[PDB]
Amino acid sequence: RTLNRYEKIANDIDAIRGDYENLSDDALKHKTIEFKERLEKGATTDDLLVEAFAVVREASRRVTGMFPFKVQLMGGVALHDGNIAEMKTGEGKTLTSTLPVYLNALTGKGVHVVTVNEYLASRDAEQMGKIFEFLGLTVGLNLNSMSKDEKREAYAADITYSTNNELGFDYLRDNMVLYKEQMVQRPLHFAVIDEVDSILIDEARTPLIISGQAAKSTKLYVQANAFVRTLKAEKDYTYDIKTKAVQLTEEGMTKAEKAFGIDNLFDVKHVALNHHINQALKAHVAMQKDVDYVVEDGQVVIVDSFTGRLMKGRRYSEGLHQAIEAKEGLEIQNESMTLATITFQNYFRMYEKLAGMTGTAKTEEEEFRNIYNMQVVTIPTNRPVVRDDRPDLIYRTMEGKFKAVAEDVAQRYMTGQPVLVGTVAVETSELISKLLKNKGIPHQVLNAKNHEREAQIIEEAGQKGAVTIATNMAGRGTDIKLGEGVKELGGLAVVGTERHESRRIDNQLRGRSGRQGDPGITQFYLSMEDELMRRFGAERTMAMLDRFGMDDSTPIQSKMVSRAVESSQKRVEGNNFDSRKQLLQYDDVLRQQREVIYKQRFEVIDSENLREIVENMIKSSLERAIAAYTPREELPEEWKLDGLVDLINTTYLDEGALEKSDIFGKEPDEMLELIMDRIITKYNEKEEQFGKEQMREFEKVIVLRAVDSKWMDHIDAMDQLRQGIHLRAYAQTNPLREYQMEGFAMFEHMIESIEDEVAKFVMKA
């Protein structure tokens, strides 16, 4: 019903192929001006799809010599219709990005192209920049290293290639701006997101968070870490393998109360040092050194969990990164507090039109339709894959597993074909590297600290005798071109190591191996004491694993473990799915509140006269004050109007500017109107006292500071309530329902605090 439509449009573009093949180079550069003049006449983007794709399909051949396939045209139309276009891993999914971005950049509004990491961003940006800048448009590029002027010139171009973290951080640093011309990102139009199962599925959990500075404390971390250094590995603390949660035992609690001299660890007085013991314990035994970070040049530089790259700017929250820096004897940088927060779901729900593509999406088509209202189109390949996904040789121990990995890489190096060795962590990669060092194999390690060498390795890793050990930098999106005579031997032979947390992440390595119909061999070599099995393995299989002996020279052949592997990884992907469906409906509350507060902050920013809005804030504050001091079910003769005029003379007016004999016993709305008459006279006197130019800047500084400070405080209180909202289900209530009601209540108290504090600071000075 749609695939035949895509085939029909692809045959139309292939039919009008012959008209644009004999044109000059200046004709195709004039052709984008012709399309833009045609869009400035009354034509929609959908009526010009066939001519636009014919022009791009000629221009890409003119630039790079490669010519788009009819399958790629099907994918381009399925991207332009606004839903996810799944193509198999290695079939040409950057030229299917090249197709609709031209048509949707003709409107004059910007088109963002999203990808997972800066290497793929740079590669796609240079190649498609050659295509588009031959064709006529202008192409930006967004990085972590760019200044705000270079970012503004990048978004100011027609087409922007970027990652996801930098789009989220630019949005959050544009909703933290003081001027309307200082912010970076344009109003959002269209985002062709690449590796959608990575960005909107795997990483939707995790939010982008820009944090501001805070005051520094240091005397707790060192002491807490000093105390944890001397604990016993299972007598004092219990490291749960499954959920990675650490708790002290009762002997450990007694040792804590003995070491710190306190009478009771668990109390309201010692919640700070209880937190520091918990975070020092988590930093010592929960996360390991090269597994979860990297120590470069005197600072803890963490690795990303999903793409395995070196996040050189980000810091752990809740005072964990300071506990790591106190663990390894570094200097303790000052702790921060949250200034803004978004998720990738709530960020990419702000684009006017989404479009996406990946290699594996029919696993998550249901969640795509239920969240983003995007359905997955399954698209052919036009050449069948010759890649043979051999079954996974499941061994018994880690030592025998890596021994068999080294034997396989030696056997395939002696015949002369490339081998890529998948990994997850980076100390496992160093282990495989020093295991292949003392055998005679010139390998070439691809760590989380070797990104210039990522560029050269991926240039020189499809040659006659190259061996690569890749943690996650060549585990998604990375293409490897086969050298001379290589595909006559088999091409890349991906020898995977660890079974990942998804079939998608598993199949991406298979996609590295086999591309464009070239052959390729994949074999996972996983153990039975891997991190996956040791965390989320069935207890009966770990009991019945005893019947296999100890000789780890041959893989375990029985089907019980070959059922337990898929059972464990379906368990971990179901746990991630359930954790996402708990996070979605709890972040929709802050989605509502954040869109309200950011829209109103932006219309504060781009306004030129804040007089009526500041007066309305003062009216709301003053009517809440008189309604709080003059109750209606209580007798109208006893209202404590002396206390009312004391509060008004303290907050709003001067000392002797109001007394009880001025107004007494009158109706409260006319009392509100009289005090607002006094407010407007004092406001006009102050506005004439230092000019009606500095007054608007002064009140704009006060309003923006109020919004930013109370929104910071409300994010912190909202997270503190989201911690313990799940305990409410012990009264058979609904925790989401109680979360929504109490979140609305504290949102209204936030707005009341904003209005009261801006009224006090405006009418103070």
Partner 1 sequence: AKKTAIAIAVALAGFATVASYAQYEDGCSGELESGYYYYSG
Partner 2 sequence: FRTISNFMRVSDIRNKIIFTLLMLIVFRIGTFIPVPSVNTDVLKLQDQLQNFSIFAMGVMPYITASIIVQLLQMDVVPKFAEWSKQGEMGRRKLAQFTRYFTIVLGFIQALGMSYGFNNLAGGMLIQNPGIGTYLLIAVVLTAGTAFLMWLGEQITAKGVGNGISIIIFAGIVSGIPTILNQIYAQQLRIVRLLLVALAVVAVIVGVIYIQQAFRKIPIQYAKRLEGRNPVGGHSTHLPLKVNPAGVIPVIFAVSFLIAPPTIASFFGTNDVTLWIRRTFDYTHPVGMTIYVVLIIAFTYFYAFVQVNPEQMADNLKKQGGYIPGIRPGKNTQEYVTRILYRLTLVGSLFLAFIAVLPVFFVNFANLPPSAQIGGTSLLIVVGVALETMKQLESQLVKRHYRGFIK
Ligand X SMILES: Nc1ncnc2c1ncn2[C@@H]1O[C@H](COP(=O)(O)OP(=O)(O)O)[C@@H](O)[C@H]1O
Residue 90 or 140 with smaller CB distance to ligand BEF? 90
Residue closest to 441 by CA, chosen among 429, 449, 433, 453: 433
Question: Shortest distance, CB of residue 452 to ligand BEF, whole angstroms?
Answer: 22
**x/- map, 448-487, Mg ion, by CB under 5 A:** -----------------------------x----------
Question: Does the annotation place 90 within a ligand binding site?
Answer: yes
Q: Considering the rule CB under 6 A, would residue 475 count as an interface residue with ligand BEF?
A: no
* Window 505 to 524, contacts with ligand BEF (CB under 6 A): 511
94 is in an annotated binding site: yes
Angle, helices 611-629/641-651, rounded to nearest 10 degrees: 150
| Side-chain half-sphere CA neighbours of 347 within 13 A | 27
CA torsion sign, 41 to 44 to 47 to 48? positive
Show Cβ contacts of residue 226 under 8 Å, excluding neighbours closer than 6 positions: none
Interface pick for ligand X out of 89, 358, 417, 522 (rule CB under 6 A):
89
Tokens of 237: 């603390």
Least separation in angstroms between residue 454's CB and ligand BEF is: 16
3-state secondary structure of 244: coil
**Shortest Å distance, C-beta 57 to ligand X:** 9
Find out whether 526 and 395 touch, Cβ atoms under 8 Å: yes
CA 454 to chain centroid: 23
User: Which entry of partner 1, ligand BEF, Mg ion, none binds 541, CB below 5 to 8 A by partner kind?
Assistant: none
Closest CB to ligand BEF belongs to which residue?
359
Instruction: Give, as ranges, the residues between 721 and 740 that touch partner 1 (CB under 8 A).
Output: 732
Which H, E and C letters describe 50-78, residue by residue? HHHHHHHHHHHHHHHCCCCCHHHHHHHHH
Q: Does residue number 586 form part of the binding site for partner 1 (CB under 8 A)?
A: no
Residues that bind partner 2 (CB under 8 A): 217, 240, 243, 245, 247, 249-250, 253, 264, 266-268, 271-272, 274-275, 278, 318-319, 335, 337, 539, 571, 574-575, 578, 592-593, 596-597, 600, 603-604, 613, 616-617, 619-620, 713, 716-717, 720-721, 723-725, 727-728, 730-734, 737, 740-742, 744, 747-748, 751, 754-755
72 versus 89: smaller Cβ distance to ligand BEF? 89
Radius of gyration of the chain (CA): 31
Q: In the structure encoding, which two tokens stand for residue 358, read together?
A: 């990946």
**Pairing state of beta strands 246-248 and 237-239?**
antiparallel
d(CA 518, CA 513): 9
Question: Which structure tokens are listed for 489?
Answer: 């031997």
Q: Which of 68, 75, 90, 308 binds ligand BEF (CB under 6 A)?
A: 90
276 vs 510, which CB is nearer to ligand X? 510
Secondary structure of 688-725 as H, E, C letters: HHCCCCHHHHHHHHHHHHHHHHHHHHHHHHHHHHHHCC
67 annotated as belonging to a binding site for a ligand: yes
**What residue has token string 């121990």?**
397
Residue 517, both tokens: 């119909």
By CB under 6 A, residue 93 contacts ligand BEF: yes
The reply on whether position 416 binds partner 1 by CB under 8 A is no
What is the CB neighbour count within 10 angstroms for residue 9? 20
- Distances in Å between the Cα of 132 and the Cα atoms of 155, 487, 632, 705 are 16, 32, 70, 43
Instruction: Name which of residues 339 to 378 contact partner 1 (CB under 8 A).
Output: 339-340
Q: Does 320 bind partner 1 (CB under 8 A)?
A: yes
90 binds, among ligand BEF, partner 1, Mg ion, none (CB under 5 to 8 A by kind): ligand BEF
31 belongs to an annotated ligand binding site: no
**H-type helices in 438-551, by residue range?**
452-459, 503-513, 531-536, 539-544
Given candidates 5, 27, 212, 240, which one binds partner 1 under the rule CB under 8 A?
A: 212
Choose from partner 1, partner 2, ligand X, none: what does 575 bind? Cβ within 5-8 Å by kind: partner 2
- Contact, 708 vs 750, CB < 8 A? no
Of 418 and 477, which has the nearer Cβ to Mg ion? Answer: 477
Q: Would you count residue 422 as binding ligand BEF (CB under 6 A)?
A: no
Among 53, 306, 316, 348, binds partner 1 (CB under 8 A): 316
Q: Which two tokens stand for residue 78?
A: 């399925």
Q: Which of 479, 623, 738, 752 binds ligand X (CB under 6 A)?
A: 479
83-91, 199-207, 306-314, 328-336 -> range binding ligand X (CB under 6 A): 83-91
Residues that bind partner 1 (CB under 8 A): 165, 169, 172-173, 176, 206-213, 302, 311, 313-318, 320-321, 336, 338-340, 732
Residue stretches of the annotated binding site? 66-67, 72, 90-94, 479
Residue stretches of the annotated binding site for ATP? 66-67, 72, 90-94, 479
